[PDB]
Amino acid sequence: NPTRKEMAKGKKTAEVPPNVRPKVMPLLKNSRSVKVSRINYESSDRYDKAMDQLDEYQIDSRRLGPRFQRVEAIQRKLDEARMHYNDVRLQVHTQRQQYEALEAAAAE
Amino acid sequence: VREIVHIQAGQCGNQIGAKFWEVISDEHGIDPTGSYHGDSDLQLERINVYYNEATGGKYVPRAILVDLEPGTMDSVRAGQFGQLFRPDNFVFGQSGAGNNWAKGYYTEGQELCESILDVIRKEAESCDCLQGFQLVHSLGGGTGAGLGTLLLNKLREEYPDRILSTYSIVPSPKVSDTVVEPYNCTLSVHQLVESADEVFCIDNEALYDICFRTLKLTTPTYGDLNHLVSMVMSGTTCALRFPGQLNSDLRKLAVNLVPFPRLHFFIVGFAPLTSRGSQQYRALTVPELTSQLFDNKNMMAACDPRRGVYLTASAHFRGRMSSKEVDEQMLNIQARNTSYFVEWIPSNVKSAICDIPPRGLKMAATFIGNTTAFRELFTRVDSQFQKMYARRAFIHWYVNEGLETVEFDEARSNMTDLIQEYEMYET
Amino acid sequence: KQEAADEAEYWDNVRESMVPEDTETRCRLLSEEERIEILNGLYANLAENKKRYASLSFGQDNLSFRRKKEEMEREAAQLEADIKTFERPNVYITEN
Amino acid sequence: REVAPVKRQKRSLHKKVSPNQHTEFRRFYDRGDIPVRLVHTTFKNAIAWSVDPSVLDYQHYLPLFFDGLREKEEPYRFFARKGTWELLKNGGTRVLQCIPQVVIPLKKALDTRDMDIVPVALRTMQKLVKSSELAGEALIPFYRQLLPVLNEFSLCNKNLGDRIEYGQRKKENIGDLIQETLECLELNGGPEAFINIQYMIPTYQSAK
Amino acid sequence: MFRDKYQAGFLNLFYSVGSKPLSIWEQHVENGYIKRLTDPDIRSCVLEIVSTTVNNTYITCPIDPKEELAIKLPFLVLVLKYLKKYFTFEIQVLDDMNMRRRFRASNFQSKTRVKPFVCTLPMRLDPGWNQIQFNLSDFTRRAYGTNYIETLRVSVFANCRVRRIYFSDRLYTEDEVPPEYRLI
């Protein structure tokens, strides 16, 4: 309950660790119902704002998650392929020097 | 409230001013970047006296730095508090003086005068009410002495009401540093007498004496000497910034101590002073401060008052203490040593109390007195100058700058009149 | 409900892993215990140094003796400057 | 709701540019052909003439000094400024023949949009017009090639409000400098000055 | 404010010399600049207000939009430097019928219509500093025919340099004034 009064006060909804949000929301809904049962409209409104911000944050968190995962996977592929390209370039260079060393011997 | 604009000519004056702003910044709690991070609300009561505010939580001091070579300016910027100083306030020339008083006064003074006046006008008009300016300069040199005399005359012309407070360092008679030192002080004193409202004298010889009498440091540097001067600097202007039980300003100090217009050259001293290890043994009380202030060893001007007589005396205190004890101490020192005080002026001692003491010091005090012992100082420089003047060779440098040779006799005659004036007021 | 919490927590944890915040307001404020520990260490060091300074000799002059007095003087000055720096109740630092 | 996703607006870069090492005045001074010398009297750096101004050929020598204004390095900059100012103020009526030849280097100098070249050219604009009491009326056909740069910096000014300005000595404010030359041109140009200036820079208001 | 204060002699409302001259006024800037600088003609610091749109750059007093002045002095004296550009300013006064009126003058104005809400006046100045004196009580008595009540609000627009805005109990000619309260 000490935390649930802070998002009623204006908490960022990000200072709360993710494990605490599922246990916060039932209290916020119940306290809003009490505050709207008593004739007090602004006290219910701040609770309504707090819960909606919590829901909006978590919804886009789901929408944003997979995008980051896809980017990371492609990035590691790009680094892996670049390393292989550098190795192939060195292999090509060594082969060309090897052929030239034989051609010079043949020419002389 | 009531602002003071601070002026730093001189390679000496720049270092003194830099240390003075370090002391004030520590006293008020100002970050080297200028942002307030202090702990006392009283520090913002009258911070406007020395500082102008730059929107964004930045305070800029009312400091103006004057020089003839950029080397001093480069050194000041390299200091810890170099960012605090406003870059545009730095006004300097490119052709130095080289301890040549005439060269600084005429050749570069005319050029530097016109420009620097615009900043001094700007900051003087950037306050709701101006009390007086403040000048820190050396007398044995050629940049601070000559240029300061020119600017002092200009300041008097532009601002007659405002108090031109000047702090100067007299050339060391035993060992100071240049061949030509008597000439510079000779020509500077004449300008100082007529224009400056208050002049304070400090000698490096006494500072080294104070170091080995009291502080017991092995290899003192210029930082310690500049710190003591800045300590006297803060004590003089402390009553303006903080409340107290008996308040006095520069105007009150001038009214009480100055009986006649030309008798205004003052000596300065500070208490308490104790070596680094002996401070535990000492019990700091009001009588102990009285003993230290009136003691000859703590006096920072090389002129023993016992050889002369006292005209007026003034004492100021920082911290919380009983006013009855201060009054009793002042009365006792006056009755005990009646052989030193002028008969026709009773109650020669002034008193004042300031509530807030400096950091680390539970109780502190500052003494400013006026005495006839100053006649020894002008006698010494006159004696050295006399055989300088009878051998014209060295003045030929100053002759090139257009200075008439008759200028030297006018200054010397003025000193002779001042010495005579101090003589007959003793009787 | 546990399954829903697991899904919610995982994606929340993945999102928070990518976005950091600047340390201008996050600069660490030292705890009272650490401040006391540093203060007492400096206090003991200063007391020892001044005790050494008191234990010297009169009239003795040489390169080693005057260098000892110089070093002990500057050591004490540095320690008291540090002590005054840590004298404040709130100290904000960025540890290296 | 969102309806577009477009570009970013250009971030006002008009003051930063600063090229170097352009002028032709260098090559004539790089071989000691320019009859100017530096005097190191300690008061102010002063220049000396290897050729007296009475016998100087204005048509060939004056345009060279106007070329040197585009220089960025010290000696060419100082020699160009002092030589140009001295020649313009003391030359007198002989300058009027050199206007069509010195406008082009002045046009090149103004077109650089440099931080420091434009103030010098603006001051040169002032001094060129006040040569004797004429030749400010001969710049009227040259407004269409000289003034187009002044539009670029016309409205730039330091907005402070309650703060007292500190830079009045080393006055660098482009707005005040532009205003001074525009008043000088408007006063000296004549009856047709305001028509051409207003056509070129519509923001300006009369001095008649 | 100024309801309580003793008002006799001179009461200055703006002065360019000091720490924060505009600390008493509100500032609105569009398409222009407001700057405080040193003017060479008087060798003293003055305030500068210049904009491309004179209507959208002005200073108003008092700061707070709801509050009103209580300046009992009938005379308002303006000291400003004319910059050969468009100029305008307005003064708000109260009338004996418990009514509010505003007198906006302009140099680019043409007529002098006196419609009930606002009053328009054309004026012409000379190049350089001016000493415009406006007698509020006389103007209300003569033009609107009503009686004058204490000044309410003051606004000054751009394209001018203003260093003195003060009130006097009566009209003073030259030298019956503090030496600071006149032009060099």
Ligand SMILES: Nc1nc2c(ncn2[C@@H]2O[C@H](COP(=O)(O)OP(=O)(O)O)[C@@H](O)[C@H]2O)c(=O)[nH]1
């Ligand atoms: N007390 C003190 N005096 C200094 C210091 N640095 C320079 N001076 C003084 O500066 C004087 C020389 O001044 P000069 O070189 O001509 O420059 P000026 O001060 O502007 O005239 C000497 O008499 C020195 O005593 C310092 O750190 N402390």
